[PDB]
Design a binder for these strands. Structure first.
Length: 72
DNA sequence: CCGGAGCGTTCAGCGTTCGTTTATCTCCCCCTGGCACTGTCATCTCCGTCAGACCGTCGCA
């Protein structure tokens, strides 16, 4: 239990469980520039709270492709 | 005026007690072997390095 002071008294010692900054689950779209390609490349990713992640990179060599956990 | 008795010290007969062993008797530890309805493919990893190089590898040309 947390006391009225906001602390956990565990093993006779006073601890605090701080909040954690993380990325919010959802879709995320990014744009980048490659010197070799001389063109812009866009990417999308769907990061969940618990499950696996999937990505979609468009026009690496003017083809759009999917990354299912970056396997093949 | 030596002589004897009492006293001090020092050894040989057998008589008991120790110092160190030995095999037998309980209690425990430790390893190999038995179980007979059937039961025949797990497991979660890993992401918001990072920075570029070194290198071999590999399919396209």
């Amino acid at each position: 239990l947390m006391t009225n002071k906001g602390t956990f008294v565990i093993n006779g010692t006073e601890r605090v469980v701080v909040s954690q900054l993380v990325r919010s689950p959802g879709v995320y779209f990014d744009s980048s520039i490659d010197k070799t390609s001389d063109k812009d490349i866009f990417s999308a990713k769907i990061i969940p709270s618990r499950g696996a992640w999937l990505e979609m990179e468009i026009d690496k060599r003017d083809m759009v492709g999917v990354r299912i956990d970056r396997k093949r």
